[PDB]
mmCIF file of C-alpha atoms and ligand atoms in Angstrom:
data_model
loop_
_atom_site.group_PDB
_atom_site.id
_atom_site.type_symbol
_atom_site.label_atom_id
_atom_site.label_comp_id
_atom_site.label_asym_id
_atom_site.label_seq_id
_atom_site.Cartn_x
_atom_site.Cartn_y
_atom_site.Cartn_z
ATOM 1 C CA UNK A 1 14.485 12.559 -73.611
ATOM 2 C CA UNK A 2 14.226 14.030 -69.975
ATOM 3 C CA UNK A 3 16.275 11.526 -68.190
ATOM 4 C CA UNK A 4 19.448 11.912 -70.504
ATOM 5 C CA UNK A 5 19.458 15.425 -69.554
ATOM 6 C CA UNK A 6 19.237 16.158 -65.625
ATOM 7 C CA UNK A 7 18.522 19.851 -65.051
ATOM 8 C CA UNK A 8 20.966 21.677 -63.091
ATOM 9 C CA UNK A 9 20.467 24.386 -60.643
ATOM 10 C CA UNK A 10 22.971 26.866 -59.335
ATOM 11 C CA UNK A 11 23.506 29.202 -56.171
ATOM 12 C CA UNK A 12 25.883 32.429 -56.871
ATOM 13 C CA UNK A 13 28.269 32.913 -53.844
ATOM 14 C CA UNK A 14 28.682 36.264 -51.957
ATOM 15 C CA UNK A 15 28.285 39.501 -53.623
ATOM 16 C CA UNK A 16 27.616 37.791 -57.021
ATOM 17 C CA UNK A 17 24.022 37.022 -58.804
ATOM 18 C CA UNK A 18 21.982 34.758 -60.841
ATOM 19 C CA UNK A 19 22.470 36.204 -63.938
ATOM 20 C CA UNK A 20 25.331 37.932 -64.862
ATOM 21 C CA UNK A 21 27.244 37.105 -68.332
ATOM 22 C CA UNK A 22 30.486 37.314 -66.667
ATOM 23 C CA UNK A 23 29.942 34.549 -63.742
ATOM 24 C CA UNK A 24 26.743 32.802 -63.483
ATOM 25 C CA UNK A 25 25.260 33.735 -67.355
ATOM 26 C CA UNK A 26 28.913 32.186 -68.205
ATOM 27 C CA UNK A 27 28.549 29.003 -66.370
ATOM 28 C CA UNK A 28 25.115 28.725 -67.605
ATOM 29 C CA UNK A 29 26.188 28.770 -71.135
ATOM 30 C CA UNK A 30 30.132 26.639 -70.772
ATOM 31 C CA UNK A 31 26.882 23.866 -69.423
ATOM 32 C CA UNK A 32 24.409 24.193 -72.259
ATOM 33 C CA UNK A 33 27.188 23.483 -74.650
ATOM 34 C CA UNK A 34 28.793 20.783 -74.093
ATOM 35 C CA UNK A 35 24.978 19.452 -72.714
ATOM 36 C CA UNK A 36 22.442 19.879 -75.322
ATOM 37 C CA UNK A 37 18.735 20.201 -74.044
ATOM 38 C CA UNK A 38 20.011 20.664 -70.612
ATOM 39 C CA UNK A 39 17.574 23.058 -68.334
ATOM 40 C CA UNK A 40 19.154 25.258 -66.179
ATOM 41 C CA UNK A 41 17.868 27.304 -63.192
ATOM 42 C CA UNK A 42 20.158 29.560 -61.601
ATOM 43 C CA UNK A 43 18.761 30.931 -58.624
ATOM 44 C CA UNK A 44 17.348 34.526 -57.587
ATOM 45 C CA UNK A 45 16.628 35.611 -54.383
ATOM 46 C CA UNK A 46 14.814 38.407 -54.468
ATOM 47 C CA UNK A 47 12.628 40.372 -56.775
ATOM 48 C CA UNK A 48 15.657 42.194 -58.640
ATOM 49 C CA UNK A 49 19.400 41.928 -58.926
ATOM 50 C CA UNK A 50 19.581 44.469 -56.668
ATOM 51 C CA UNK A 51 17.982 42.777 -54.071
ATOM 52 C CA UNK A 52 20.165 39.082 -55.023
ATOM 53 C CA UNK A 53 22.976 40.933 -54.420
ATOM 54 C CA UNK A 54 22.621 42.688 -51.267
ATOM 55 C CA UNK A 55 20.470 39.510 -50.043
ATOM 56 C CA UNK A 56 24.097 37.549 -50.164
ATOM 57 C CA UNK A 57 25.106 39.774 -47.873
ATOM 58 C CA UNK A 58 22.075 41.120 -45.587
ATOM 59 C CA UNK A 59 19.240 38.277 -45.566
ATOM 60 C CA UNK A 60 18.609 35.572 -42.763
ATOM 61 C CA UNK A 61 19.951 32.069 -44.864
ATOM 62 C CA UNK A 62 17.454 30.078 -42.869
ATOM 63 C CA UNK A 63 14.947 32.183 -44.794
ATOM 64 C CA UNK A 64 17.114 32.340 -48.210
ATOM 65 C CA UNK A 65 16.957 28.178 -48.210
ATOM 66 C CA UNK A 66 13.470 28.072 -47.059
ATOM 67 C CA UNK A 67 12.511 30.610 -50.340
ATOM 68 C CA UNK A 68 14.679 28.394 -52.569
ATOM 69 C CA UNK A 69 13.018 25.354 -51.599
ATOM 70 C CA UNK A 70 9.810 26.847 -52.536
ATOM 71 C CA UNK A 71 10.885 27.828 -56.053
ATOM 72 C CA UNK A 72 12.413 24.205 -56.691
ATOM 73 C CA UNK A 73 8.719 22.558 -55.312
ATOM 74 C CA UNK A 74 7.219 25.021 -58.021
ATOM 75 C CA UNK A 75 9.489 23.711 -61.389
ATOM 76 C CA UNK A 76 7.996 20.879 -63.200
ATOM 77 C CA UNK A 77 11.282 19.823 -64.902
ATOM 78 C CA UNK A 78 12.710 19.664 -61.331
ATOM 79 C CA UNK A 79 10.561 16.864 -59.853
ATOM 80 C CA UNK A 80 12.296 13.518 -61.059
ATOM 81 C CA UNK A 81 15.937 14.591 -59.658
ATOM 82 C CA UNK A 82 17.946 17.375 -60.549
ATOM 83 C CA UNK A 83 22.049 18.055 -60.156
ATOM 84 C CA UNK A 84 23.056 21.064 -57.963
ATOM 85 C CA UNK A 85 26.146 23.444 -57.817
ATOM 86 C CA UNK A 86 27.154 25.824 -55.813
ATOM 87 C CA UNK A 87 29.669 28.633 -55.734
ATOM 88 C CA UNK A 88 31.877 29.786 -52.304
ATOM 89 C CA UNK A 89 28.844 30.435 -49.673
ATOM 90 C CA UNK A 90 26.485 29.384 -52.460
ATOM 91 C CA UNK A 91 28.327 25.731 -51.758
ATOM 92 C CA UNK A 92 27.235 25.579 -47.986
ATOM 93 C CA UNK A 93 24.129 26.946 -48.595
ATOM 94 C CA UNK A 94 23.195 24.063 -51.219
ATOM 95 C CA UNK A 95 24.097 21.160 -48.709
ATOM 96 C CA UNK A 96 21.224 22.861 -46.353
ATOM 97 C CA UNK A 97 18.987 22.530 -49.288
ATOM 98 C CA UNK A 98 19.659 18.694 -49.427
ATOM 99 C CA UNK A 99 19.378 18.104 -45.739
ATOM 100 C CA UNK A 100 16.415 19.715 -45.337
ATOM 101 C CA UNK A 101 13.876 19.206 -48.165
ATOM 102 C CA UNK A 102 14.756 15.944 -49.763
ATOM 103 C CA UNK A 103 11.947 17.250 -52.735
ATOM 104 C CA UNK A 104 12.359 17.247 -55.282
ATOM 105 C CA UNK A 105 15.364 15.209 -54.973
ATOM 106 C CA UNK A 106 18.835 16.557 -55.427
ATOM 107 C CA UNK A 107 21.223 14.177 -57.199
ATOM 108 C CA UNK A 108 25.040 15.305 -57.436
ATOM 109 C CA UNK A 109 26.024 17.831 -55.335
ATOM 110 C CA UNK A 110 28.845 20.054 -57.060
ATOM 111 C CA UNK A 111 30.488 22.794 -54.459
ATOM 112 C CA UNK A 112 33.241 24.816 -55.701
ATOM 113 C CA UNK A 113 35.304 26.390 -53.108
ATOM 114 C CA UNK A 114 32.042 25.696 -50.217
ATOM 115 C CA UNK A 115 32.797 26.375 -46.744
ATOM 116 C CA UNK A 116 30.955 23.212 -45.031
ATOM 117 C CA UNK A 117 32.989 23.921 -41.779
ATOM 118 C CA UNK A 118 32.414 27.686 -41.665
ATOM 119 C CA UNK A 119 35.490 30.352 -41.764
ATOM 120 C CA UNK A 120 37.794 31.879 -39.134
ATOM 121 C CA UNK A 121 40.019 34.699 -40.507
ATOM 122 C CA UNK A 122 39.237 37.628 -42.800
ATOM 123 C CA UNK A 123 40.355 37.734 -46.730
ATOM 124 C CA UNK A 124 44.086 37.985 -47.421
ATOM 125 C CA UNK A 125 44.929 38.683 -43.592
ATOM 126 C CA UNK A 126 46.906 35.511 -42.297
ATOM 127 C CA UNK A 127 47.050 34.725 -38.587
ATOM 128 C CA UNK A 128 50.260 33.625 -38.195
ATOM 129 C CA UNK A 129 53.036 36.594 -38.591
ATOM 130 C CA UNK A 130 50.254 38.648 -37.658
ATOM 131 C CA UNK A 131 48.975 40.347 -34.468
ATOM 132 C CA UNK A 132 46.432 42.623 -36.027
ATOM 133 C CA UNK A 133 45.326 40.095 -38.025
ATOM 134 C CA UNK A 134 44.701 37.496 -35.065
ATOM 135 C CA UNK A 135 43.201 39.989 -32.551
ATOM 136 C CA UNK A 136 40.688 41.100 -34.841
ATOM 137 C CA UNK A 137 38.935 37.265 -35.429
ATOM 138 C CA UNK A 138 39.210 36.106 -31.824
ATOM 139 C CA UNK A 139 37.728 39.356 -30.962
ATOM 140 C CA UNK A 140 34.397 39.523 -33.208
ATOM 141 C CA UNK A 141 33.321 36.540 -31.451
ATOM 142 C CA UNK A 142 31.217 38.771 -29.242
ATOM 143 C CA UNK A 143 29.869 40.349 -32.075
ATOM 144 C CA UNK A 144 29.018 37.824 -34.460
ATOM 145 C CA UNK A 145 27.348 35.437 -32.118
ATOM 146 C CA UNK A 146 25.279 38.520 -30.790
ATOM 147 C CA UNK A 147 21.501 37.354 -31.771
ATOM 148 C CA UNK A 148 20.522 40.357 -33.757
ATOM 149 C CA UNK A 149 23.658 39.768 -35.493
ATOM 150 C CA UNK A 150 23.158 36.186 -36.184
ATOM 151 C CA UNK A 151 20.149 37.225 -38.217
ATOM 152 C CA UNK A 152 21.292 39.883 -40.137
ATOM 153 C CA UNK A 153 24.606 38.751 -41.011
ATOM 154 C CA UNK A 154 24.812 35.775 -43.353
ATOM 155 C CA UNK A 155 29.088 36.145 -42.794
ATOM 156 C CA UNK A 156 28.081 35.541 -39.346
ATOM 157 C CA UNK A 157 26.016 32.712 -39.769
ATOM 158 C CA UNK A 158 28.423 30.584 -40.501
ATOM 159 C CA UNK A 159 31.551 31.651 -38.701
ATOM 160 C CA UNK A 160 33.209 29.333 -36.792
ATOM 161 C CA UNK A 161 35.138 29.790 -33.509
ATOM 162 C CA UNK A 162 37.530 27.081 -32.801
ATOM 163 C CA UNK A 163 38.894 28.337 -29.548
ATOM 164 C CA UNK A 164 35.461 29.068 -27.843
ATOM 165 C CA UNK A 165 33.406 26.177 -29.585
ATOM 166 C CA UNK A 166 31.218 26.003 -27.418
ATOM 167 C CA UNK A 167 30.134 29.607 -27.921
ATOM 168 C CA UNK A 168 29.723 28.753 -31.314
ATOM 169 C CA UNK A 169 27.745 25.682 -30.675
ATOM 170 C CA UNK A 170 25.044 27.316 -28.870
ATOM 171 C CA UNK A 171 24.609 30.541 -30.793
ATOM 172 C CA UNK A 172 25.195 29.702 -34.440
ATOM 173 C CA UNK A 173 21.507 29.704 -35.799
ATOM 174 C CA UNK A 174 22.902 28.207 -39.359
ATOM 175 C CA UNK A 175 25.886 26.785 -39.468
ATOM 176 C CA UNK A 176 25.792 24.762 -36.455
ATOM 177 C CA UNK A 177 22.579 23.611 -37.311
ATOM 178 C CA UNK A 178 23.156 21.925 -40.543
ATOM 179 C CA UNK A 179 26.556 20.159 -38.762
ATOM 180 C CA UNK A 180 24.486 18.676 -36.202
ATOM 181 C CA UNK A 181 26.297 20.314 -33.337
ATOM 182 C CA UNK A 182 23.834 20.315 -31.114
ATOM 183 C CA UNK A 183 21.996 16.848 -31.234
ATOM 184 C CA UNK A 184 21.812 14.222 -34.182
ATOM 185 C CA UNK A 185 18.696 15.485 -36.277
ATOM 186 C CA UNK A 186 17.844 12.224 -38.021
ATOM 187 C CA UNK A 187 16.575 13.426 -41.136
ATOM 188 C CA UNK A 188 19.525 15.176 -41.870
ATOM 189 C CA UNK A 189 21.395 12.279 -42.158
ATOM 190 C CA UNK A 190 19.291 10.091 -44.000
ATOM 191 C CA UNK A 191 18.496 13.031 -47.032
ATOM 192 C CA UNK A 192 22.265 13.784 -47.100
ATOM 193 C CA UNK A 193 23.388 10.070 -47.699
ATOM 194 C CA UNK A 194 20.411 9.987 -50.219
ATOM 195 C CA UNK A 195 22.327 11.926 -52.945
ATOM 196 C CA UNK A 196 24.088 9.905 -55.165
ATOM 197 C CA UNK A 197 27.696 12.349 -55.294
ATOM 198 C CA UNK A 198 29.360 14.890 -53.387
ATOM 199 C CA UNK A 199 31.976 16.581 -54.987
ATOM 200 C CA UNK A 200 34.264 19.535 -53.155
ATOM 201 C CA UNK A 201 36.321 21.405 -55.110
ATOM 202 C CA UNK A 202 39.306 23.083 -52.985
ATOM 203 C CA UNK A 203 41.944 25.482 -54.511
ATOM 204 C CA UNK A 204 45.010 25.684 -53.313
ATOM 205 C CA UNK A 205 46.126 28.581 -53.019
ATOM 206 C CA UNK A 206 43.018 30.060 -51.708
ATOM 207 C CA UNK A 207 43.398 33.538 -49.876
ATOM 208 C CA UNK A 208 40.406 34.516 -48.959
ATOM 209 C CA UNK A 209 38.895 31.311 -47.450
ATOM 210 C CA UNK A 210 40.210 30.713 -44.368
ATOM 211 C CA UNK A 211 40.975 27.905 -43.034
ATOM 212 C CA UNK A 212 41.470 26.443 -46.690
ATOM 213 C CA UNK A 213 40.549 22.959 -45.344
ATOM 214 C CA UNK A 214 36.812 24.023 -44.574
ATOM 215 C CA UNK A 215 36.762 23.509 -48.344
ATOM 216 C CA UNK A 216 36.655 19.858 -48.051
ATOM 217 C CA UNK A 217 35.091 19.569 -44.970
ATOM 218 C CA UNK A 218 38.118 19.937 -42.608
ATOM 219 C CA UNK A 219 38.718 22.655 -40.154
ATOM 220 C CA UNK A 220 41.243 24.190 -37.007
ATOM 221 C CA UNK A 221 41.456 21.383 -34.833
ATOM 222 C CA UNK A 222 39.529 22.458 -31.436
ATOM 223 C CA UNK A 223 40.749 24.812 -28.873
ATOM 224 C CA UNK A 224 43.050 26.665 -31.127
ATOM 225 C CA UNK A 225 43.169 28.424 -34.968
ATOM 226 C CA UNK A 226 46.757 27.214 -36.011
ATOM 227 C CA UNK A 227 46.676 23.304 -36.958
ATOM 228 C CA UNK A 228 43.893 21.789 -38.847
ATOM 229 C CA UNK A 229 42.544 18.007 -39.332
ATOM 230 C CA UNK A 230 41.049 16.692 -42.003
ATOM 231 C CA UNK A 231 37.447 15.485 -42.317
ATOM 232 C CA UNK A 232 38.326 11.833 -41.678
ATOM 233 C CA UNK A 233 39.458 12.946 -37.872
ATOM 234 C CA UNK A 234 36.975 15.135 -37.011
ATOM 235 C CA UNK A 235 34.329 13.830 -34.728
ATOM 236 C CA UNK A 236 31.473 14.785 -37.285
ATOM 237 C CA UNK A 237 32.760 11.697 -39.457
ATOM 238 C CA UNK A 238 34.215 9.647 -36.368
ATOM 239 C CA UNK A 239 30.462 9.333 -35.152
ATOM 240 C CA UNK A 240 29.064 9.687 -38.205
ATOM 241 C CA UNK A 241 26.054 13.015 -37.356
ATOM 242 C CA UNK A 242 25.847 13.173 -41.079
ATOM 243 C CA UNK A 243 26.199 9.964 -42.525
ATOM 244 C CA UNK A 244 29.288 11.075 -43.778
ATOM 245 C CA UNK A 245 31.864 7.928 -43.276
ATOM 246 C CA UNK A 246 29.513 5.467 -44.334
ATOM 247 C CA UNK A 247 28.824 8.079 -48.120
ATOM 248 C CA UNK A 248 32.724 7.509 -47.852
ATOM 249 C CA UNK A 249 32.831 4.005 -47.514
ATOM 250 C CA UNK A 250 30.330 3.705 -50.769
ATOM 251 C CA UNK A 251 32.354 5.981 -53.125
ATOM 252 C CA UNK A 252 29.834 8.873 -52.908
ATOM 253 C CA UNK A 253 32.367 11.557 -51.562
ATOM 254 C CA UNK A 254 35.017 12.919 -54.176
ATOM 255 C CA UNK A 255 37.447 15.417 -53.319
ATOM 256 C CA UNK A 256 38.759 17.886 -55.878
ATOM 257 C CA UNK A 257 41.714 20.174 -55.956
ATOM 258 C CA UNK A 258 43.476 22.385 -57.958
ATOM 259 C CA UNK A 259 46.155 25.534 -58.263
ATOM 260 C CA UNK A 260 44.709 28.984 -58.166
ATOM 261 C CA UNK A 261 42.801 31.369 -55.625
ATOM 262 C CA UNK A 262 39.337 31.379 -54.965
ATOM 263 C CA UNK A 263 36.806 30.352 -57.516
ATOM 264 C CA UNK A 264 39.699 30.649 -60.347
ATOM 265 C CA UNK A 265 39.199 27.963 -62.739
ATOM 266 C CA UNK A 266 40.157 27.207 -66.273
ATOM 267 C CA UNK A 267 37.589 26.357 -69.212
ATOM 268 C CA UNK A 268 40.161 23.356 -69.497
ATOM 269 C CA UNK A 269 39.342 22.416 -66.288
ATOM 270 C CA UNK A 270 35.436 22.803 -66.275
ATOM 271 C CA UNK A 271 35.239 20.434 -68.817
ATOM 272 C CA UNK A 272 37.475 18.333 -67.730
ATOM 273 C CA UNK A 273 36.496 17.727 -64.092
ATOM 274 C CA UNK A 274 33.203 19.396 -63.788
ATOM 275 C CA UNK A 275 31.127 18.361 -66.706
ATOM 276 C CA UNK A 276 31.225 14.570 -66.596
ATOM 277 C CA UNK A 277 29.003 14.695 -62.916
ATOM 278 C CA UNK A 278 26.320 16.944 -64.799
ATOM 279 C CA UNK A 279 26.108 14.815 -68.036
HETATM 280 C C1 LIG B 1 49.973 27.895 -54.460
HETATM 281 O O1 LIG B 1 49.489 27.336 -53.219
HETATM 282 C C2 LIG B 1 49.211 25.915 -53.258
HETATM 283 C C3 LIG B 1 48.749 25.510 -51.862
HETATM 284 O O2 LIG B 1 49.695 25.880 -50.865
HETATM 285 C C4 LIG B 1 50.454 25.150 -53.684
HETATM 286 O O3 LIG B 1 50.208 23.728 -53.634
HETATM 287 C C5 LIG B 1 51.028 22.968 -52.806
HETATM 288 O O4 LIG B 1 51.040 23.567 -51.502
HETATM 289 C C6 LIG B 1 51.794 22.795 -50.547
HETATM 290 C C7 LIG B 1 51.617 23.468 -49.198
HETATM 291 O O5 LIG B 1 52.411 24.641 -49.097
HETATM 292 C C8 LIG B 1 53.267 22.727 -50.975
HETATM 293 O O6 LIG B 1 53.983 21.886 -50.079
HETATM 294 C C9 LIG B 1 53.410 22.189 -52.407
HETATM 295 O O7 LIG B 1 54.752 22.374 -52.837
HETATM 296 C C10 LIG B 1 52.455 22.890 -53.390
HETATM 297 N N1 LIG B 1 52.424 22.151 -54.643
HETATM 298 C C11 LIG B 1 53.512 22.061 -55.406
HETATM 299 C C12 LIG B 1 53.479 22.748 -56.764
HETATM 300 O O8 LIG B 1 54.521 21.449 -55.057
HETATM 301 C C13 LIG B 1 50.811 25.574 -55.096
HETATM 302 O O9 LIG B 1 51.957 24.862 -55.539
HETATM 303 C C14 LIG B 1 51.103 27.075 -55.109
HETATM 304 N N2 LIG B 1 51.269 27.513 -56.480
HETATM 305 C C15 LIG B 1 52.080 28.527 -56.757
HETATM 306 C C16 LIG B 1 51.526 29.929 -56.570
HETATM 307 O O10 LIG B 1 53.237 28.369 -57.152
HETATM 308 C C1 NAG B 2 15.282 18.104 -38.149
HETATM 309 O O1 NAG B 2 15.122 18.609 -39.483
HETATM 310 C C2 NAG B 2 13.741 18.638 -39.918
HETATM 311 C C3 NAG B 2 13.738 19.146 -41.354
HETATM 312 O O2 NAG B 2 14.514 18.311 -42.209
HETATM 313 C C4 NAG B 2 12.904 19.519 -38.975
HETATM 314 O O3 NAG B 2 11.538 19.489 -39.363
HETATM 315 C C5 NAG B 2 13.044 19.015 -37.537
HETATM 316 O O4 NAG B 2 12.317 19.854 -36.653
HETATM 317 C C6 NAG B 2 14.525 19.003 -37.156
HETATM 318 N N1 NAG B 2 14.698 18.568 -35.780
HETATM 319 C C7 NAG B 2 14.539 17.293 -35.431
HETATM 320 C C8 NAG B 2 15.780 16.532 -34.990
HETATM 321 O O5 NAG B 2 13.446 16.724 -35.444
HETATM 322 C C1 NAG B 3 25.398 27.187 -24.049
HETATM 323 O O1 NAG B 3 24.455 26.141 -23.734
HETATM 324 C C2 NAG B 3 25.053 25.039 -23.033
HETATM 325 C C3 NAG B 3 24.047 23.911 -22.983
HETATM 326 O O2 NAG B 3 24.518 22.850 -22.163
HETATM 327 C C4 NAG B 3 25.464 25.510 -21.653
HETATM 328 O O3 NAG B 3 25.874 24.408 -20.855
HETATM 329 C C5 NAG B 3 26.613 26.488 -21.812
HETATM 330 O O4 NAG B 3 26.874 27.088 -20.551
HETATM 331 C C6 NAG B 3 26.325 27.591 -22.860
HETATM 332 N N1 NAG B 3 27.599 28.028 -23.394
HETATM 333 C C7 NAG B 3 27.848 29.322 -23.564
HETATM 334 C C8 NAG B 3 29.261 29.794 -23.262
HETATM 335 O O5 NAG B 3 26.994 30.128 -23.942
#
C-alpha cells in the first residue's frame, strides 16, 4: 500500500540532469530495486534537457524552487509526505524547498555533498600554498555580489565571503536568505524542524567543494578563509535561526561521511547508508 512506499524526489546538481542513465536514470533505478512500488520523480527544470542543463548554471534559483514547488503541488502521489534527495547544489537547493513550502510535506531530507553554508574557493585550486589561487576568490567579491550578477548566476547565489560578511549578508539574494542572515523569518524555522531527518553526506577528500565543512553545515570561521568551525559553534545553531540545535537535541540531524571526492560513492555504500532513510 501507499504508506509502505514513500515516493522520493530528486534534484540533479550542477551541470547534470533529471534523466540521464549514467547519474540520475542510475539512482532512479539502484532505488526502485531494492524498493519495490516506490514512485520516483526526479526533477526537470525546463522544457528539455537542454534547457535543465544550462538552467543549473544560468537560471535565478529563487525562480528554479518556486517552479519546483509548483510541480510537487501538482503530483497526487506527493500529497501525504514524500522523501527528498539532493545532489551537490541540488542539496542546498532542496533545504529551500522545505523552508519555504511546507506542502506537500517533505519527510527525510537526503543531501549528498550539499553546500548549506555556500562555497569560497574554485575547484581543485587550494588557498593555502597559493597566491593565484587566493587573489582570485577574495577578488570576485565585487563581481558576484553585483545585482545583475546575483540573478544570473546561480554559482553566485550562494557564494559566501567570510572576510567581508557583511557584504555577503546584504547582497546574497539566495543563500543568505534561506540562513536567516538577515532577520529570523519564523516560518523557516518551524517547516525546517517539521521534517522528520536530515541527513548530510560529506566526502572527505572532496576537491572541488570548498570549504569541505559547508558539507555539513560548517564553514571559515568569520573574518578570514583559513580555519573553519563546525556547525555546533556557529552562531546559526548557537541562537538557533533555524531550529537547528533543538532538531539536534531530538536525533533528527545525522551526519555522514565517507572517503572519496565529490559525489563518488560506492553501490556498497548506497545501500548500505542511503537506502534504509528511503525505505
Ligand atoms: C583523503 O582525504 C580524507 C580527508 O582529508 C582523508 O580522511 C582523513 O583526513 C584527515 C585530515 O587530513 C586525516 O587526518 C586522516 O588521516 C584521514 N583519514 C585516515 C585514513 O586516517 C582520507 O584518509 C584520504 N584518503 C586517501 C586519499 O588516502
Ligand atoms: C518568510 O518566508 C515566507 C515563506 O515561507 C514568506 O512568505 C515571508 O514573506 C518571509 N518573510 C517573513 C519573515 O515573513
Ligand atoms: C548593507 O546593509 C547594512 C544594513 O544595516 C548597512 O549597515 C551596511 O552599511 C551595508 N553593508 C555593505 C558593505 O553593503
Amino acid at each position: 500500500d501507499p504508506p509502505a512506499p514513500l515516493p522520493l524526489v530528486i534534484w540533479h546538481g550542477m551541470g547534470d540532469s533529471c534523466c540521464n542513465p549514467l547519474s540520475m536514470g542510475a539512482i532512479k533505478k539502484m532505488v526502485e530495486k531494492k524498493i519495490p512500488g516506490i514512485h520516483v520523480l526526479s526533477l526537470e527544470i525546463g522544457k528539455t534537457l537542454r534547457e535543465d542543463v544550462e538552467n543549473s548554471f544560468f537560471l535565478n534559483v529563487n525562480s528554479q524552487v518556486t517552479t519546483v514547488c509548483q510541480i510537487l503541488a501538482k503530483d497526487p502521489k506527493l500529497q501525504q509526505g514524500y522523501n527528498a534527495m539532493g545532489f551537490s547544489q541540488g542539496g542546498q537547493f532542496l533545504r529551500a524547498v522545505a523552508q519555504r513550502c511546507p506542502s506537500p510535506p517533505m519527510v527525510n531530507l537526503i543531501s549528498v555533498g550539499g553546500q548549506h553554508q555556500g562555497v569560497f574557493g574554485l575547484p581543485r585550486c587550494p588557498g593555502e600554498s597559493s597566491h593565484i589561487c587566493d587573489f582570485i576568490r577574495k577578488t570576485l567579491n565585487a563581481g558576484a555580489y553585483n545585482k545583475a550578477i546575483q540573478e544570473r548566476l546561480v554559482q553566485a547565489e550562494y557564494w559566501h565571503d567570510p572576510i567581508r560578511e557583511d557584504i555577503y549578508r546584504n547582497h546574497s539574494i539566495f543563500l543568505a536568505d534561506i540562513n536567516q542572515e538577515r532577520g529570523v523569518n519564523e516560518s523557516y524555522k518551524k517547516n525546517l524542524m517539521a521534517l522528520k531527518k536530515f541527513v548530510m553526506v560529506k566526502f572527505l577528500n572532496d576537491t572541488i567543494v570548498d570549504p569541505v565543512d559547508s558539507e555539513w553545515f560548517g564553514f571559515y570561521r568569520s573574518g578570514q578563509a583559513k580555519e573553519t568551525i563546525p556547525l555546533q559553534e556557529s552562531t546559526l545553531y548557537t541562537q538557533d535561526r533555524l531550529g537547528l540545535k533543538a532538531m539536534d537535541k531530538a536525533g533528527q540531524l545525522v551526519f555522514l561521511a565517507l572517503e572519496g571526492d565529490h559525489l563518488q560513492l560506492s553501490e556498497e555504500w548506497f545501500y548500505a547508508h542511503i537506502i534504509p532513510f528511503l525505505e
